[PDB]
Amino acid sequence: NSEEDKQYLIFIKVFQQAMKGNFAKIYAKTEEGKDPPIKKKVERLRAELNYCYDELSFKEYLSDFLVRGGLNKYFNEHQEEIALLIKKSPWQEIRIWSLLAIASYKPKD
Amino acid sequence: NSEEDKQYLIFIKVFQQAMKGNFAKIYAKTEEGKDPPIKKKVERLRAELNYCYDELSFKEYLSDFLVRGGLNKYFNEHQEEIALLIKKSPWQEIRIWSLLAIASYKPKD
Amino acid sequence: NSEEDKQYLIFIKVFQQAMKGNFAKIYAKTEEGKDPPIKKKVERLRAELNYCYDELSFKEYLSDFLVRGGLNKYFNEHQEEIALLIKKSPWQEIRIWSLLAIASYKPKD
Amino acid sequence: ADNLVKGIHWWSNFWEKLVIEDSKEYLFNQLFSNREGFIIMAENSEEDKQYLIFIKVFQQAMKGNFAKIYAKTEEGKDPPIKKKVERLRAELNYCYDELSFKEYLSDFLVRGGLNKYFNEHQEEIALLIKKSPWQEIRIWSLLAIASYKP
Amino acid sequence: PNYYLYGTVLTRYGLASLNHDIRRGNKTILQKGYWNNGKIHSFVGSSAIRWALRFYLQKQGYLVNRVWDEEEHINRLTSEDFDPEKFYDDDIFGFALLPNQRMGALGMNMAVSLTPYDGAVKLGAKSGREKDSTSLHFTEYHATRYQYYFGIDATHLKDFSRILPMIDGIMNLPKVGGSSNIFNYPFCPDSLVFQWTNHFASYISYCFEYCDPKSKEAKLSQEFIDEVECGQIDPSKLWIGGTIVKDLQQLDNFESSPLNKAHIYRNRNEMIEALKTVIKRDLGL
Amino acid sequence: PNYYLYGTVLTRYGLASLNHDIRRGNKTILQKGYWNNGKIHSFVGSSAIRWALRFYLQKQGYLVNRVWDEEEHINRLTSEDFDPEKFYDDDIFGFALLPNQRMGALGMNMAVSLTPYDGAVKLGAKSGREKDSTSLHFTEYHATRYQYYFGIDATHLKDFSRILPMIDGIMNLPKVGGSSNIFNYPFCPDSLVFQWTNHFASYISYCFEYCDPKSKEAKLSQEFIDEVECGQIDPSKLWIGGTIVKDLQQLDNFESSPLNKAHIYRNRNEMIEALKTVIKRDLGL
Amino acid sequence: PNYYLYGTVLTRYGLASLNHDIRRGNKTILQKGYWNNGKIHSFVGSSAIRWALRFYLQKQGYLVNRVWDEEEHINRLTSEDFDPEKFYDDDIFGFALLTPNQRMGALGMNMAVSLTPYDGAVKLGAKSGREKDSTSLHFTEYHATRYQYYFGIDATHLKDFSRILPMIDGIMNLPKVGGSSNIFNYPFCPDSLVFQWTNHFASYISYCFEYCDPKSKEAKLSQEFIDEVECGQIDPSKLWIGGTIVKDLQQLDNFESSPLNKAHIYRNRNEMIEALKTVIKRDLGL
Incomplete structure (x- = not known):
C-alpha cells in the first residue's frame, strides 16, 4: 500500500x-x-x-557509503x-530516512 | 487494542x-x-x-535524538x-507522543 | 515517463x-x-x-571506462x-549516478 | 435520583448539568458544596478508575x-499560586x-517533572x-484543578 | 394547478460568525451541531434568512406590515390587524398574533455549513493599558460555504405576482444576521439548484458536498446526480446555475447524461430570468 | 437610492507578526487557521483594521468620540452620549453601551495570508549575562501578502460625505496593531478590486488568490475572472487598480475580454480619484 | 504636521554569521526561512540592529538610559523610571517596564533579509591539537551575501524633534551588529540607500533592492519599484537614493526621460545624508 512507502522501507533496508x-x-x-571500533564508527x-x-x-556521501557497503541484495531487487x-x-x-536506518539496523544485530 | 494503539505504544517505548x-x-x-545535569537536560x-x-x-531533531540514543530494542523488534x-x-x-513518552519516563531502579 | 529519468536509467544500465x-x-x-580481485577492483x-x-x-575517465568495458549494447542503441x-x-x-550504478550492478549476477 | 430510578449510572452527565448547562452555577455551586460527594460516587464508579488515575497524574x-x-x-x-491556578x-x-x-496537556505534564503515577500506569x-x-x-483536567488539595 | 418552487442554495467562501448561540464565559460560541458523517457543522438559522427577506421587501418599497426602524433597532406594526391581501410579509411569511394566523407560503430550512467545523477561534481585546473585566474576549468563527433549503407554494400566495420579489430577494439577499463588524460574510448565492414542478416530491434538498474536508471546492452530491440519472426528477423541471455549472460541464460523458437536457446556465441572472419567464407563463402573470 | 462599496485589497510583501494569539510558551503564537486547500494560513484581525482606520481619522482633524492618547496608552471619550450626527467615529464604526447602538457603516472581514504559514519562528535574547526568565523568548513571523474584504453601506452614513475619509484612510492606512518595533509591516495596499453598485449582491470576496507556495506573484484568480466573463459583475461597476494591472494587461485575449472595459488604472491614485468623482456625482455631494 | 521617514538600506557584500539561531549541535545555524521564490534566505534579527543603534548613541556621547558596560557585558540603567524627555534611547526605541511606563517607539524596523539565497557555507573549527575533548570540534555556518532591511520613523512622535538627526548618523555609521565578529567581521555600514521622507503612512518601498542572480553581487533595483516610480506614485521629490546603486541607475537607458531622474539621487552617501538632514530641519523648524 502506497508504493512510495514501500520504496522508503526498502531504502531503509538498503542502507x-x-x-x-x-x-x-x-x-x-x-x-x-x-576492540573493533563500532560505537566510534557509528558516532562518526x-x-x-x-x-x-x-x-x-x-x-556524494550517500552514494559513497552505499558503495562501501558492497553487495546489497535489497538494492539488487529494485x-x-x-x-x-x-x-x-x-x-x-x-x-x-538514513538516520532512521541508523537506528533501525540494530534489529539485525 | 487496535493496531494504531500498539504502534503508538512502541513509539513511546522507543523514545x-x-x-x-x-x-x-x-x-x-x-x-x-x-551530579551531572539531568533535570536541566530534560528541560532543554x-x-x-x-x-x-x-x-x-x-x-530532523527526532531522528538525531533516536540515533544519539543508541541500540533501541523496541525499535529493533519493529x-x-x-x-x-x-x-x-x-x-x-x-x-x-514524544512529550508523553518524556513525561512517562520510568527511572531505572 | 519523465524522459530525463529515462536517460538516467539507461546511463545506469550502460555503466x-x-x-x-x-x-x-x-x-x-x-x-x-x-581469488580474482573483484572487491578490490570495486574499491579501486x-x-x-x-x-x-x-x-x-x-x-576522460568515464570515456576510458566505457571503452575498456567493451561493446555496450545499450550504448549502441542509445x-x-x-x-x-x-x-x-x-x-x-x-x-x-555512476556511484549508484556501481552499487547497482549486483543483480546482473 | 433520576438516574438511579433509571438504573443507569448516576454519573450520567453531572458536569454537563453542573457547568455546561449551569453557567449560572446554580447547581455548580452545589457541586462546590458537594464536590466530595461527586467524587465519592465517582469512586464507586469502577470505570472512573482510569480517570481517577489521570486525576492523580495531573x-x-x-x-x-x-x-x-x-x-x-x-x-x-508572595508567590501568585492563585493567579497561576486562574491562568x-x-x-x-x-x-x-x-x-x-x-499540545498544552503534554507540555504541562512534561513541565511537571517526574510523575510516579504516570510511570506506574x-x-x-x-x-x-x-x-x-x-x-x-x-x-477531567478542570476537575483535577478544582479538586487539588495538598 | 398546484405549482411549487424548491431550491437548495450555496453561498460563497468566507469567514462567518453569523449565528452565535448562548455564550459561555468569555468565548462567544457560534451555534453548531452534527450533520453528515457525524462531524460537527455550523448552522445559521432559517429565521435569520426570513428576516433578511423581510428586510429586502421593506427596502425595495413593497408594503410590508412589519417596518424595521434601523436607527431605533425596533420593529413596528403598520396595522394591528394582519391583512395578507395587502401586505407582502403577511402574505408570504405568515403571522400569529395570539383571522388570526396564516400558514405562510415560504417554508425555509436551516443554513448548514458545507465543511465541518474544526473549532477555530479568534481573540479580541480592548485596546489601552486601562484594562477591565470587559478587556479581552474570544469570538468563534468558521470559514465555510453555507447551504440552506427552502420551499414555497405558488398557489398558497394570496397574490401570485408576489413570487417574483421573493425570488429577486433570494438572488439579492441582504445581510443575514451576524457580526458584520469583524466577520462580514456575504450570503449572496453563487450556485443554485431550483425545481419548479406541479408534484410536491422534492429531491434537491442539500444536494451539495465537499471534495475535501477542508477546502473550497463545492461539488455536486453523488446522490442528486444519480437520482437524475435513474429517471425521476425530470430534467425539464430542473434549474441549476452558478459556479457548479463549470464542474458539471467538466464531468465526463456530460453530453450523454440526462443532466445535459436540464436548464443549466453559467450566469445566475440568465437562469433566474428564464425561470421567472417560465413562472409568469405558468401562473398567467 | 441604496449604494454599497465592496472591495478586497492586497497588502505588500514583507514579514508579519501583527496578530499574536495567546503566547503559548515563549512563542508569541501568530494567529492562524485553516483556509483554502486545507493549509494553515496566518490571520490579521479585522478589528485591527478598524482600529487603524479609527486612528487615521483621529490623526487628521475629523472629530471622533474615542481619542487615543498615544502617551498614556488609554482611550478617552469626549462625550459619553454617542452622537453619530457629529462624530465621524460613531457615524462610521458604531457603538454599544451595555441608546441607539447604531449599526456601523463599515463591515470588515479578517485579513488572510495569501500564502500558507510553515513555521516562520524567530529567536529573542536580552543582551548578555544576568539572565532571568525573561531572557529567552520566541516570536513568529510570516513573509507573505495579506488580503481582506470590506464593505460599506453608503446610504447608512449619517453624513454622506464621510465615505471620502475612509477611502483616503484605506489608501493610507497607518500602522496596523502588531509588533512594529521588530516587524514593521506597512499595510498600504498594492492591488485593489473595488465595486460600486446599487444592489446588495456582493461578489468580489477574497478573489486575490495565487497559492504557488512560497512566492509573491499574487495572481488575481480563476473564479473571479470567470464570473466577469459570464456576464454578472458588469465591468462598468468594477474598479481594478494596482500592480495586479500589470499582470492583467499581459493576459492573452485581454482586449476582447469583458474585463477590458472595466475601470482599470495601473496607478492607484488615479483610480481612487475616479472612484471619488463617481461617488460624489452619484450621492450629490 | 505628521512626517514619516521610510527607507530601505542594503549592506555591503561579505561573509556574515550574525544570526545564530538555536545551535542544534556543533553547527551554529543562521536564522533562516523561506523569503522569495521558495528559496531559503538568511535573516538578521532587527533587534540586533536596534541594539547596534543603541550602542552607537551610547558611544558618541549623548544620554542613554541603558548603558552597555562593555567589560562585564551587563546592562545598567541610569534611572529606573524611564524618562523619554531626557534619555535618547527611551525617547527613540521605547521601553516596557512591567510618566507612562510604556513607550511606543519612534523607530520601527524590519528584519534584515539576505539578497542571496543561502545554500551551504558551513565552516569547521578545531581547537589547537592533542588532548581533544568534547569542545574540540565545532562547525560555524556563514553566508556570502548582501543584507537589506527596512525601517521607518515618525519624527512627530519623538519627544524632541532634534533626536531624528543622531539616528540617521547611527544608521550610516552603524557599529558591529551582534554576531561572531571575532572570526566573521561583517561591516554593516550602508553602501546603497533608498530613503523616502513624506507626510503620509504609505511607504511602498519596503524591500526595493533585489537582484537574485544566486551567488553574485550585482545588487540591482527591483523592477516593481521602478515601475511604481514611473507610475507617478511615490513622488520623486520625496525620494532619496544614494550609494553604489546610483551608478547602475545612471547606466540605465532613457534614464533622463524616466521620472527617476527627477528624484534626489546622489552617488556619494554623505552628501545625500546632508541634503536629507537639511530638508528635515527645514520642514521641522530646527
Whole structure:
C-alpha cells in the first residue's frame, strides 16, 4: 500500500545492509585483541551525516557509503525505484530516512 | 487494542529507550562534579521539542535524538511499523507522543 | 515517463554493462586457484571515481571506462541520448549516478 | 435520583448539568458544596478508575509546576499560586480543538517533572489520552484543578 | 394547478460568525451541531434568512406590515390587524398574533455549513493599558460555504405576482444576521439548484458536498446526480446555475447524461430570468 | 437610492507578526487557521483594521468620540452620549453601551495570508549575562501578502460625505496593531478590486488568490475572472487598480475580454480619484 | 504636521554569521526561512540592529538610559523610571517596564533579509591539537551575501524633534551588529540607500533592492519599484537614493526621460545624508 512507502522501507533496508557491509569491513580490518571500533564508527557516521550543505554534499556521501557497503541484495531487487528515489526527493528527507536506518539496523544485530 | 494503539505504544517505548541512552551518555561523559545535569537536560529537551516549527525540523531533531540514543530494542523488534508511523503521521502528533513518552519516563531502579 | 529519468536509467544500465565487460576481462586475466580481485577492483573503481577535479578529469575517465568495458549494447542503441546526457549536466551529478550504478550492478549476477 | 430510578449510572452527565448547562452555577455551586460527594460516587464508579488515575497524574504535574514556581519565587515576595491556578483554568478553557489541547496537556505534564503515577500506569494513561475525546480530558483536567488539595 | 418552487442554495467562501448561540464565559460560541458523517457543522438559522427577506421587501418599497426602524433597532406594526391581501410579509411569511394566523407560503430550512467545523477561534481585546473585566474576549468563527433549503407554494400566495420579489430577494439577499463588524460574510448565492414542478416530491434538498474536508471546492452530491440519472426528477423541471455549472460541464460523458437536457446556465441572472419567464407563463402573470 | 462599496485589497510583501494569539510558551503564537486547500494560513484581525482606520481619522482633524492618547496608552471619550450626527467615529464604526447602538457603516472581514504559514519562528535574547526568565523568548513571523474584504453601506452614513475619509484612510492606512518595533509591516495596499453598485449582491470576496507556495506573484484568480466573463459583475461597476494591472494587461485575449472595459488604472491614485468623482456625482455631494 | 521617514538600506557584500539561531549541535545555524521564490534566505534579527543603534548613541556621547558596560557585558540603567524627555534611547526605541511606563517607539524596523539565497557555507573549527575533548570540534555556518532591511520613523512622535538627526548618523555609521565578529567581521555600514521622507503612512518601498542572480553581487533595483516610480506614485521629490546603486541607475537607458531622474539621487552617501538632514530641519523648524 502506497508504493512510495514501500520504496522508503526498502531504502531503509538498503542502507542497513550497506552499513552491515561496512561493519564487516571494519571488523576485518581490526587485528590483535584491540576492540573493533563500532560505537566510534557509528558516532562518526552520524556526525558526518549531520554535516552536509545541500545536493552534491551528502548525496556524494550517500552514494559513497552505499558503495562501501558492497553487495546489497535489497538494492539488487529494485533498481529503478531506488535510483529514482535517490536522484529525486529533497536531500533532507533522505537524511531523515538514513538516520532512521541508523537506528533501525540494530534489529539485525 | 487496535493496531494504531500498539504502534503508538512502541513509539513511546522507543523514545523512552532513546532517552535512556542519551542520559547514560550524559552520566558517563560528565561523571565529574556532585551530579551531572539531568533535570536541566530534560528541560532543554522539552524546549528543543517545543522549538520545532514544521515537520522537517522536528523530524530532523527526532531522528538525531533516536540515533544519539543508541541500540533501541523496541525499535529493533519493529522496523517497518514504526518507520511508517514516523513518516506518515503528522509531525505534531509525533510531538505529543514524544512529550508523553518524556513525561512517562520510568527511572531505572 | 519523465524522459530525463529515462536517460538516467539507461546511463545506469550502460555503466553496469561496461563494468560487466571489465569484470569479464579481469576474470579472463586471472588463472588457477587465486581469488580474482573483484572487491578490490570495486574499491579501486570507487577510489578512481572519487579522485577527480572537474570537467576533463572524470570525463576522460568515464570515456576510458566505457571503452575498456567493451561493446555496450545499450550504448549502441542509445548513442545520442547517452552522449548528450554526458556532455550536459554537472559532472558531480554524473559521478553520483555512476556511484549508484556501481552499487547497482549486483543483480546482473 | 433520576438516574438511579433509571438504573443507569448516576454519573450520567453531572458536569454537563453542573457547568455546561449551569453557567449560572446554580447547581455548580452545589457541586462546590458537594464536590466530595461527586467524587465519592465517582469512586464507586469502577470505570472512573482510569480517570481517577489521570486525576492523580495531573495533580502531581501541577504539584511539580507549583514547586518550580516556589523555587522561582523571590524571598519576601508572595508567590501568585492563585493567579497561576486562574491562568491554568483560562488556558485550558482557551483550547479549541484536539491538537492544541493535547499540545498544552503534554507540555504541562512534561513541565511537571517526574510523575510516579504516570510511570506506574504508563500504558493505561497513554491510551486514555490517545482515545478519549479532548473535551472529556479537558473536563477531567478542570476537575483535577478544582479538586487539588495538598 | 398546484405549482411549487424548491431550491437548495450555496453561498460563497468566507469567514462567518453569523449565528452565535448562548455564550459561555468569555468565548462567544457560534451555534453548531452534527450533520453528515457525524462531524460537527455550523448552522445559521432559517429565521435569520426570513428576516433578511423581510428586510429586502421593506427596502425595495413593497408594503410590508412589519417596518424595521434601523436607527431605533425596533420593529413596528403598520396595522394591528394582519391583512395578507395587502401586505407582502403577511402574505408570504405568515403571522400569529395570539383571522388570526396564516400558514405562510415560504417554508425555509436551516443554513448548514458545507465543511465541518474544526473549532477555530479568534481573540479580541480592548485596546489601552486601562484594562477591565470587559478587556479581552474570544469570538468563534468558521470559514465555510453555507447551504440552506427552502420551499414555497405558488398557489398558497394570496397574490401570485408576489413570487417574483421573493425570488429577486433570494438572488439579492441582504445581510443575514451576524457580526458584520469583524466577520462580514456575504450570503449572496453563487450556485443554485431550483425545481419548479406541479408534484410536491422534492429531491434537491442539500444536494451539495465537499471534495475535501477542508477546502473550497463545492461539488455536486453523488446522490442528486444519480437520482437524475435513474429517471425521476425530470430534467425539464430542473434549474441549476452558478459556479457548479463549470464542474458539471467538466464531468465526463456530460453530453450523454440526462443532466445535459436540464436548464443549466453559467450566469445566475440568465437562469433566474428564464425561470421567472417560465413562472409568469405558468401562473398567467 | 441604496449604494454599497465592496472591495478586497492586497497588502505588500514583507514579514508579519501583527496578530499574536495567546503566547503559548515563549512563542508569541501568530494567529492562524485553516483556509483554502486545507493549509494553515496566518490571520490579521479585522478589528485591527478598524482600529487603524479609527486612528487615521483621529490623526487628521475629523472629530471622533474615542481619542487615543498615544502617551498614556488609554482611550478617552469626549462625550459619553454617542452622537453619530457629529462624530465621524460613531457615524462610521458604531457603538454599544451595555441608546441607539447604531449599526456601523463599515463591515470588515479578517485579513488572510495569501500564502500558507510553515513555521516562520524567530529567536529573542536580552543582551548578555544576568539572565532571568525573561531572557529567552520566541516570536513568529510570516513573509507573505495579506488580503481582506470590506464593505460599506453608503446610504447608512449619517453624513454622506464621510465615505471620502475612509477611502483616503484605506489608501493610507497607518500602522496596523502588531509588533512594529521588530516587524514593521506597512499595510498600504498594492492591488485593489473595488465595486460600486446599487444592489446588495456582493461578489468580489477574497478573489486575490495565487497559492504557488512560497512566492509573491499574487495572481488575481480563476473564479473571479470567470464570473466577469459570464456576464454578472458588469465591468462598468468594477474598479481594478494596482500592480495586479500589470499582470492583467499581459493576459492573452485581454482586449476582447469583458474585463477590458472595466475601470482599470495601473496607478492607484488615479483610480481612487475616479472612484471619488463617481461617488460624489452619484450621492450629490 | 505628521512626517514619516521610510527607507530601505542594503549592506555591503561579505561573509556574515550574525544570526545564530538555536545551535542544534556543533553547527551554529543562521536564522533562516523561506523569503522569495521558495528559496531559503538568511535573516538578521532587527533587534540586533536596534541594539547596534543603541550602542552607537551610547558611544558618541549623548544620554542613554541603558548603558552597555562593555567589560562585564551587563546592562545598567541610569534611572529606573524611564524618562523619554531626557534619555535618547527611551525617547527613540521605547521601553516596557512591567510618566507612562510604556513607550511606543519612534523607530520601527524590519528584519534584515539576505539578497542571496543561502545554500551551504558551513565552516569547521578545531581547537589547537592533542588532548581533544568534547569542545574540540565545532562547525560555524556563514553566508556570502548582501543584507537589506527596512525601517521607518515618525519624527512627530519623538519627544524632541532634534533626536531624528543622531539616528540617521547611527544608521550610516552603524557599529558591529551582534554576531561572531571575532572570526566573521561583517561591516554593516550602508553602501546603497533608498530613503523616502513624506507626510503620509504609505511607504511602498519596503524591500526595493533585489537582484537574485544566486551567488553574485550585482545588487540591482527591483523592477516593481521602478515601475511604481514611473507610475507617478511615490513622488520623486520625496525620494532619496544614494550609494553604489546610483551608478547602475545612471547606466540605465532613457534614464533622463524616466521620472527617476527627477528624484534626489546622489552617488556619494554623505552628501545625500546632508541634503536629507537639511530638508528635515527645514520642514521641522530646527
